[PDB]
Amino acid sequence: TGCMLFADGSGKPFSAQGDCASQLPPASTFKIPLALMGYDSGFLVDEQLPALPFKAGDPDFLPEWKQTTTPSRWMTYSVIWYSQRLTEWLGAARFQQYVDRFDYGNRDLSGNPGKHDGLTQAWLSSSLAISPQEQARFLGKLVSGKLPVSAQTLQHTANILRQPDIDGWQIHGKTGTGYPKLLDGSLDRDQQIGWFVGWASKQDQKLIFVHTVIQKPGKQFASLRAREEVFAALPEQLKKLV
Amino acid sequence: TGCMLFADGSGKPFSAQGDCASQLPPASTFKIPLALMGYDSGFLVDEQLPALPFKAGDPDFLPEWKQTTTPSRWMTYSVIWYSQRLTEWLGAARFQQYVDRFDYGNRDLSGNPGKHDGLTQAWLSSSLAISPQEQARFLGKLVSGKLPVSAQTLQHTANILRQPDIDGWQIHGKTGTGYPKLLDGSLDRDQQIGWFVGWASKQDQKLIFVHTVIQKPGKQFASLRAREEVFAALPEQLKKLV
What we know:
The structure is a homodimer of 242-residue chains.
Chain A: E1 3-7, E2 13-18, H1 31-41, H2 71-76, H3 80-90, H4 92-101, H5 118-121, H6 132-143, H7 151-161, E3 162-166, E4 169-178, E5 192-202, E6 205-215, H8 222-241
Helix pairs in contact in A: 1-3, 1-7
EC number (chains A, B): 3.5.2.6
Active site (chains A, B): 28 (acyl-ester intermediate)
Family (chains A, B): Belongs to the class-D beta-lactamase family.
């Protein structure tokens, strides 16, 4: 149920291979719509600011989460507590308004059943789910100026999301790792979902790309195998585009 | 023993307070002339490349040194093994040519006595020493286009060395932590030296700054008290400049 999708500027797919229509947890790729919310509302200033400190009681699953994070470091080490700091500040009403206006996947931010912690846990392998097709559509709106955000919100989001170049092409992307909410795809499987979503630009020309890796955990991180495979197969799509 | 120096565009000091003329180990601030050597020669490609891996046998004093380092990560966590990778690649002859043409402090790259390891250990509290005055003079040449490097070498160096802004001004800076000689042959006085060197910029207008903190070691580094003090005392100098 893995997938490699390549879409144009508008977000229209032209090459989709595998399970490109099934909805999956967005995991840390939801940091893309969050970077826009954060810059549009004013929570996030730029790439360096705000530098929020780690507090006792914040999730410390990865050692790189244990220090002061900036929006640049947030994107890099997928610091979940920095995303919760942003959402708690926005409020559940604004969060939902943004997720609705962004038309983000299933738009379900109710979270886990019972405990109504949707505000800080919706993207964390629960209520929210996006299909690789929908992700490309979303990415296509932010790259086309279709989302209700400013140029500088798009530029700050781009900067913190920037990846190594390919010739004259500017790569912007984000990795994500999540598990399907119990059985919301094809029964209990305990399979990792790797995500490598983003776009590539070279003046006028732009190209969206979405890739998923479905695997049993072991030796390689699902999302790092996704990032690798995109960088392998990208130059041909760029060449095809020119 | 400590010092707070503010210089103009050319590198000419206009305010110097404390020991601004004594030569001190440059420590990790030598990563500024190294970023220029690396970009001029072609060892360093940009801010993302090369992403060199950590190898068994490389100094692992700080945990942040233990992974794959890029030139952006090199500057931030002061990764010394990434500087040695660059110098080993340049050769001692080119290294010396650059240190001479840059007129960097005492220009002594002989290293520790007996050991012969000047190539990878010269700036690491040994042979090499620069005075806060000389540092400002050097910084003034790179900011004025006086050094024999390209515009893009200066821009890549600026990018990896960037800091949070102040009211429209662009801050570029580097922290350093070293130790002086106690006179016993080549000893270590245990008077930890903190450094915060760099420049501020708003269109035509530029301003160099050099600061040292001399203190007995503690839980945290002397250089973080230097960076803090520069950001406190900089807006007045910028206001004075306008």
